[PDB]
C-alpha cells in the first residue's frame, strides 16, 4: 500500500483506492432511490465537484444523502473516505460511506 499521508489529486486518483477527495461543486443531481433489503429508502446521488487535475463524479449514498443539505451548487467541499471506482475514460466517481464528512472549503474552516 501506498503512505496514508499521501493525499492524490483527481487525475493521479487510484481506481480501487480508499482516499480522501476534494474539489468545487459545479453540478449536483438528484439522488436514484432503490430498494435495499436494509429497509431504508435506499438512494445514491451524482455530484460533480471540479479540480485543477479534473472533473470528479462523487456517489452519495442513502446514509450521505443527508450531507446534500449542507453545501450548494457553486461552493468548495472536501469529502473524506470514499472508494475510487473509476466507470469512464476520464471522469472517474468517488462512492461515500456512511462514517464519511464533507466540509466547504476554499474559505478555509480548519
Known amino acids: 500500500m501506498k503512505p496514508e499521508h499521501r493525499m492524490d489529486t483527481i487525475s493521479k486518483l487510484e481506481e480501487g483506492a480508499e482516499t ?41 449514498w442513502t446514509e450521505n444523502i443527508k450531507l446534500l443539505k449542507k453545501f450548494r ?21 468517488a462512492h461515500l460511506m456512511p462514517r464519511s464528512t464533507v466540509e466547504v472549503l476554499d474559505p478555509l474552516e480548519h
Open 73 to 93: 451548487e457553486g461552493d468548495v467541499i472536501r469529502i473524506k473516505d470514499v472508494n475510487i471506482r473509476g466507470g469512464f475514460g476520464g471522469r472517474k466517481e
Open 20 to 60: 480522501p477527495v476534494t474539489g468545487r461543486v459545479m453540478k449536483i443531481s438528484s439522488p436514484r432511490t432503490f430498494t435495499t433489503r436494509k429497509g431504508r429508502e435506499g438512494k445514491l446521488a451524482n455530484v460533480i465537484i471540479a479540480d485543477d487535475t479534473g472533473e470528479l463524479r462523487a456517489v452519495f
